[PDB]
Design a protein around this ligand. Structure first.
Ligand SMILES: *[C@@H]1O[C@H](CO)[C@@H](O[C@@H]2O[C@H](CO)[C@@H](O)[C@H](O)[C@H]2NC(C)=O)[C@H](O)[C@H]1NC(C)=O
Ligand SMILES: *[C@@H]1O[C@H](CO)[C@@H](O)[C@H](O)[C@H]1NC(C)=O
Ligand SMILES: *[C@@H]1O[C@H](CO)[C@@H](O)[C@H](O)[C@H]1NC(C)=O
Ligand SMILES: [Cl-]
Lengths: 389, 389
């Protein structure tokens, strides 16, 4: 009656501690009921590995908890996929990146910040890059035990920025007597840690006027953020007299720009711009302009706001006579889209355009067709069926 | 007999400690000998300020040492210039940016670096931005008292990069037992200090293979350098297995690129590119490509190489009969060049062109002529004389 279609596909990322294990499942419907087969990205069948990988009676793929000694790259750091098939044909799921994570040595560090009186301070909880996908800032704590937490109230002396930095407005001599530690949390184990080093501010009292200067000399950077997150664009400059900061956004591919419009969603916290509930349209090149009496400096930031990938094929099914063409159009959403690719019954077609054309249909052209859209973080698939007239 | 010409102008920038003070001189030849006045940016006359600004004995401008309480912007943060004149005419020198810098306390710090075994490590002496113009790396020293200095020998385990970072090739577990400090020099006070924190490397041994990853997620940066310096382009990537690194330069205004040609001048140290004895032509957009068996990653760096401004006029002196044409050619070198302007006996002309033509000389056109070339940071002048026949 109908070829297979996925109901439930496992997600793109399956991250887990060796102490927890994981399970992934795949569901597909069709008539007859499709068979469910676990494969690797290269199409090869996956079987059990005693103690480490198990295909269950109901077709789940299970990774039991395991000793670090028993870690195996080809099991625990591996792209899998689910294959569903019946007599009409086969479809393969989006990529499933299985990543088991063992404990690692890490120590967070807080560089000392020198900050001119009246200017904003930004303390950073430096987390080693090789644990940073899992270990993130949970909160900050001052030397008295006051806890500073993520908050939607941006109008206070203190703000833990969504990106984890501690922002301190309008620093005064009293702010240099306080010290701060950052509490980090491992999202796979739940383990929290408080940085051993006490983060310090030194508050300077310059006598000469100082034109604005940024923390670093580079005048351009790129930033990636995801849709529906609160994206932080820093602008770490200082000056005496205290500077004013204004943000602009360039019209794509031009030398002209518009002042950013601050409102309930797009906020400025001293020099820092926070784009709340981000959407793909917030993408673009931003300009932070900092001026005082003595001069001005400007820095650019290229923001890319990503969105979850998805795809569909127009039409879901078509019945085409012999000798006549079959055409499939991959309709996709999300951002970025790096590649589009096509499959027929679980095997690649050498086509990377969004419209797949089969010029003259034959008997062996029938079956299941798929387009896959991919970027660095994500993949999505759509399936369609070709019947014979 | 002849109009004034500068034998000696002071440098575009005159930075000094309040403890040191400073003195600047102008010398000019001429017959009769030219008098030498000091003027302010706006061409106005500069007079003595007791204990802060004096014309001392032989006519140079003197800023004695002073206490922070005595600081005054009108004296200590000011563009000056030299005005030399006699019977035949007047010339004005290049801008002299005088900046007195009242001493401040500072410390440098070194972040601890996590490095995959076999990869290159780069330790950074982090100098606060408010003193970065005056404080740079002098040397590094380890826990055993071994000292590492700048060297033209790029081939050892260790290299202090020209930009001050400590580079360590091919790190192994042994390298994790050492700790490092940087010694910095303040060029205004002459002071040297050891860093407030020690740097160390944590050598990691990944459980599986790891595609190349960079120190930060930013895909682009900018870098400013000066002609004749050794310019360092970092490419701080790690991978497992240890990756290989290739450098390219984009063809200006295109998507296309060419591999960097390594020779006696342009060198590669592991992943790091060093362009020695830089020239303006080295400017452009560079691409660092990092690969290993599991993947590849790339990052862009926009380099600008400046060149010092200078100017000369052709001819230095010319005697012209009445009603005949007088021509001056302003030859100049440097990068960038934002403005070209002309001056006559210390007064601006409405001429923006490098060639000044006078096609029917009067009595009044006699005197001294100057062309000025400027950018946002720098200026240069040249003088010529017009005598009548
Ligand atoms: C230059 O200015 C600094 C102040 O910014 C002076 O240095 C301070 O001198 C006091 C003594 O009055 C010491 O207690 C401080 O430790 C010094 N501070 C620093 C940062 O060095 C210095 O005396 C001034 N120079 C002159 C000639 O007055
Ligand atoms: C502010 O700084 C910019 C440089 O980023 C400069 O172009 C502009 O002139 C400055 N504003 C004023 C009023 O000087
Ligand atoms: C190196 O990685 C880049 C991506 O940064 C990729 O374009 C290129 O194909 C890779 N080179 C090789 C030889 O694999
Ligand atoms: Cl296996």
């Amino acid at each position: 009656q109908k070829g297979p279609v996925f109901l439930k596909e496992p997600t793109n990322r399956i991250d887990f501690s060796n102490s927890t294990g994981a399970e992934i499942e795949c569901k597909a419907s069709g008539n007859p009921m499709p068979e469910i087969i676990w494969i690797r990205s290269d199409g090869t069948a996956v079987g059990d590995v005693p103690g480490l990988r198990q295909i269950s009676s109901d077709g789940k793929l299970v990774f039991p908890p395991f000793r670090a000694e028993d870690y195996r790259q080809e099991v625990h750091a591996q792209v899998y996929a689910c294959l569903a098939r019946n007599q009409f044909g086969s479809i393969i799921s989006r990529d499933v990146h299985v990543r088991a994570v063992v404990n690692q040595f890490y120590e967070a560090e807080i560089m000392t910040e020198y900050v001119i009186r009246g200017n904003a301070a930004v303390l950073k909880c430096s987390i080693p890059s090789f644990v940073a996908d899992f270990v993130r800032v949970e909160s900050w704590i001052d030397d008295e035990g006051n806890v500073l937490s993520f908050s939607d109230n941006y109008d206070g002396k203190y703000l833990v920025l969504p990106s984890g930095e501690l922002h301190i407005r309008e620093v005064g001599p009293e702010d240099g007597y306080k010290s701060y530690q950052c509490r980090t949390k491992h999202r796979l184990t739940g383990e929290t840690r408080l940085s051993a080093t006490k983060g310090r501010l030194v508050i300077t009292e310059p006598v000469g006027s100082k034109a604005p200067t940024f923390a670093t000399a580079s005048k351009i950077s790129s930033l990636l953020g995801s849709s529906s997150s609160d994206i932080v664009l820093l602008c770490q400059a200082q000056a005496f007299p205290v500077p004013y900061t204004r943000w602009y956004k360039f019209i794509e591919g031009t030398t002209r720009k518009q002042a950013v419009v601050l409102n309930d969603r797009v906020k400025q916290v001293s020099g820092t711009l926070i784009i709340k509930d981000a959407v793909v349209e917030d993408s673009g090149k931003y300009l932070c302009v900092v001026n005082n009496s003595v001069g001005g400096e400007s820095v650019e930031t290229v923001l890319t706001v990503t969105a979850p990938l998805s795809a569909k094929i127009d039409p879901p099914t078509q019945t085409v006579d012999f000798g006549r063409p079959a055409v499939f159009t991959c309709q996709y959403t999300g951002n970025p889209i790096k590649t589009v690719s096509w499959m027929k019954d679980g095997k690649a077609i050498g086509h990377s355009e969004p419209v797949l054309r089969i010029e003259s249909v034959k008997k062996e052209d029938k079956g299941m067709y798929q387009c896959f859209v991919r970027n660095d973080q994500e993949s999505a698939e759509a399936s369609a069926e070709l019947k014979l007239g």
